[PDB]
């Protein structure tokens, strides 16, 4: 029997809306209007049901739960759509669009567990915080081939669409899954890559790309506030395929790995994973031979005061990343040189700098120091004196520098960043190496990038963050409403043009722009200065964009704060460091150092020019900014190329809790997402177009004749 009929099957009690009863089918027939309203005018979004008693030519009267009579004008009136439509799976067939009703038919769903709902043209998944069974391969092989509007919404569903249309029109897929932190875009994208390995596959390279995920987890992955395995990076994933659909491979590319979190956290926050995992779960002989103790024995581990995570075992995800390590292909001393590695940073931590005879630094204990150099193959009096004492030109003259406790451990702190990064990298390329080694015919993309973020500080990392988010919306915005419109007009179907309210142009300029400068092209400009100072930077900010800009805001409650109004709000930036942020420096003698590693990993951090070395830019080196600039604009490129499909992941409340879908919390997230606006476009527009030679003419109100093809709603 059909599963998608068998109403005791786990697809009809996971995925669909229950039966309702004898006593909901009396509310369902009967004739009786509902309007949704606010019992406090200063609670926009906390709603009410109220019933229409009577009604004007242009008004509405209702009785409040309270019992009173009030009177709405019909413009402004959010009507309750008929209970028949509760639960609906595309909320594009609503009758009243409106956001309360939107809210509700998510709650509806929320409430029973169906976590997925279309809204017209993309999927919109709530965070369930608990495990759902939907995901077995039973699932798998239901959605296998199914047209969309032939199953529930899920992650799989969207998924088998974009790999039919990749066969059908012979053009590459994306499917962009955004959201805030903890919103479920990491937890989504593992659902794509197992559903197309599943539908593609052939594994053993299907088995190599299901573990990539996991070994860049352990790495780029750590316990926030919002999020107990918030994603560090970005990440693009390319499933490849050949010409019959079969998958033929995998890339990664990786973006903005928070490298402070190795030697900075947030009380109750961890560090990355993998530092926990290799203490938990190393073996007795690695721990002597790396000089492991308890996490409470390092710097980097030991000053948020949380060294676990509830219902993780930290020696089992050990066993878990190493298992993904030998499936991918990493040797055995591959993956102890990247052990080495961890423990290595973890001994720079520890090294503890202090104050000699005047002005500059000394290291009293060398403990640390050299179980570093042992972990690292390096010689440690090449070490301390790259660290305290590191060499320069002035002019042409070579010249020591002796540093203060303060400089000497910024410079420590800058020798760990490095190192963490180019390690990451390095994953990535290794990984790439083994899952990329056929030349593609298609693709389909895969986007899980860092949502946007309004934190209590907010700096350059959080700007790169929000500026990819901006970029994306743009992009989102062109594809769902600009596109759309552009060929009505062109095939002249006689169209009114509708303005959407969203546009993340001038914002997007002000960040990236060249003429008239924007924001990285005068931080880049500062960078090269050098007189330049965090005051002097601000300074520049305020006197290009200030009462100029709609989109910037000079602050009066701070002097070194700038304001940004972007597509999710306002964010208050502040720029304390930026100058070096954005120099990113690392001391020559450090680099000389670890080139002379003994260790073949190490080495190759330091040796090989696409990971080690920084584009040469004239004077002097590519900045941070421009650098991700690029980046990003080459992500676009790929991203135009493809046919995209949208995942608006969508937390349910601020406190990472089940069964707990939050009025405010929710609704800011529609209004940002556009979900509304995307409704809208699919109800009022044309949403598919076939020409007459693509099956007199009319061979026969909800079509359109136009130039070159027959729109249909
Ligand atoms: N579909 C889902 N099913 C079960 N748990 C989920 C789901 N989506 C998210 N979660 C839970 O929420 C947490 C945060 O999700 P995640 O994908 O890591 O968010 P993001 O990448 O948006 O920051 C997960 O670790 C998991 O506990
Ligand atoms: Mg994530």
Same mark, same amino acid.
């Given at each position: ?16 809306? !229950? ?79 409106? #956001? ?7 709650? +509806?769903? *929320? ?6 709902? *279309? ?5 919109? &998944?709530?965070?369930? @915080? ?9 699932? +798998? ?113 990786? *973006? ?6 190795? +030697? ?19 073996? $007795? #002989? #690695?721990?002597? /031979? ?66 000699? /005879? ?13 179980? &570093? ?90 700007? =790169? ?5 901006? !970029? ?27 303005? @959407? ?55 009066? @409650?701070?002097?070194? #704060? ?5 597509? &999710? ?23 000389? =150092? ?31 900014? /421009? ?5 990003? $604009? ?14 608006? =992941? ?52 909800? *079509? ?10």
């Amino acid at each position: 029997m059909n599963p998608i009929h068998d109403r005791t099957s786990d697809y009809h009690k996971y995925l669909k809306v !229950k039966q309702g009863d004898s006593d909901l089918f009396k509310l369902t027939v009967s004739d009786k209007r509902y309007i949704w309203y606010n019992p406090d005018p200063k609670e926009r979004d906390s709603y009410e049901c109220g019933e229409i008693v009577s009604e004007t030519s242009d008004s509405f009267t209702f009785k409040t739960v309270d019992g009173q009579d009030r009177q709405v004008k019909k413009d402004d009136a959010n009507q309750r759509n008929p209970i028949k439509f509760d639960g609906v799976e595309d909320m594009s067939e609503l009758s009243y669009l409106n #956001e309360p009703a939107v809210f509700h038919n998510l709650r +509806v769903r *929320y409430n029973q567990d169906l976590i997925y709902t *279309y809204s017209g043209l993309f999927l919109v &998944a709530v965070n369930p @915080f608990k495990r759902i069974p939907i995901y077995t391969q039973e699932m +798998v092989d239901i959605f296998k081939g199914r047209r969309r509007n032939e199953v529930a919404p899920h992650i799989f569903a969207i998924s088998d669409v974009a790999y039919r249309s990749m066969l059908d029109d012979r053009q590459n897929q994306s499917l962009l899954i955004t959201g805030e932190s903890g919103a479920g875009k990491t937890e989504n994208t593992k659902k794509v890559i197992q559903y197309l390995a599943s539908v593609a596959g052939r594994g053993v390279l299907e088995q190599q790309i299901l573990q990539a995920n996991p070994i860049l987890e352990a790495f780029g992955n750590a316990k926030t506030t919002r999020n107990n395995n918030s994603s560090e990076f970005g990440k693009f994933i390319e499933i490849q395929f050949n010409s019959a659909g079969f998958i033929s491979g995998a890339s990664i590319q990786s *973006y903005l790995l928070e490298k402070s979190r190795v +030697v900075f956290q947030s009380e109750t926050e961890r560090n990355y994973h993998i530092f926990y995992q290799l203490l938990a779960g190393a073996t $007795a #002989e #690695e721990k002597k /031979a790396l000089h492991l103790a308890g996490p409470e024995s390092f710097n980097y581990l030991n000053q948020s005061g949380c060294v676990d995570i509830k219902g993780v075992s930290d020696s089992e995800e050990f066993k878990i990343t190493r298992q993904a390590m030998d499936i991918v292909g990493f040797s055995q001393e591959e993956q102890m040189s990247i052990f080495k590695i961890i423990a290595g940073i973890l001994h720079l931590g520890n090294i503890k700098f202090e104050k000699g /005879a005047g002005e500059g630094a000394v290291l009293k204990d060398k403990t640390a120091l050299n179980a &570093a150099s042992t972990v690292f193959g390096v010689n440690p009096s090449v070490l301390e004196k790259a660290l305290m004492e590191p060499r320069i030109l002035a002019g042409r003259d070579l010249v020591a520098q002796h540093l203060n406790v303060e400089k000497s451990s910024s410079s420590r702190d800058a020798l760990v960043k490095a190192l963490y990064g180019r390690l990451f990298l390095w994953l990535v390329k290794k990984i790439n190496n083994v899952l990329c080694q056929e030349r593609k015919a298609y693709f389909i993309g895969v986007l899980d990038i860092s949502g946007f973020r309004i934190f209590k500080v907010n700096s350059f990392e959080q700007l =790169c963050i929000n500026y990819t988010n901006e !970029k994306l919306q743009q992009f989102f915005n062109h594809h769902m409403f600009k596109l759309e419109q552009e060929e009505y007009l062109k095939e002249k179907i006689n169209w009114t043009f509708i303005d @959407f309210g969203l546009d993340s142009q001038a914002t997007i300029d002000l960040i990236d722009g060249r003429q008239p400068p924007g924001i990285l092209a005068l931080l880049d400009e500062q960078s090269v200065f050098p007189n330049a100072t965090d005051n002097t930077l601000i300074t520049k900010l305020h006197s290009h964009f200030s009462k100029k800009n709609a989109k910037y805001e000079e602050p009066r @409650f701070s002097k070194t #704060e700038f304001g940004v109004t972007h597509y &999710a709000g306002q964010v208050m930036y502040e720029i304390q460091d930026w100058l070096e942020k954005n120099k990113d420096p690392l001391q020559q003698d450090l680099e000389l =150092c670890f080139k002379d590693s003994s260790d073949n990993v190490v080495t190759k951090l330091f040796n090989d020019p696409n990971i080690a070395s920084r584009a040469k830019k004239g004077a002097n080196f590519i900045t941070v900014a /421009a650098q991700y600039k690029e980046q990003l $604009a080459s992500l676009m490129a790929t991203l135009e190329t493809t046919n995209p499909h949208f995942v608006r =992941c969508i937390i349910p409340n601020n406190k990472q809790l089940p069964a707990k879908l939050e009025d405010k919390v929710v609704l800011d997230q529609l209004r940002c997402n556009g979900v509304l606006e995307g409704i809208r476009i699919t109800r009022k527009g044309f949403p598919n177009r076939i020409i007459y030679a693509d099956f007199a003419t009319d061979a026969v109100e909800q *079509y359109r004749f136009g130039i070159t093809k027959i729109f249909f709603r």
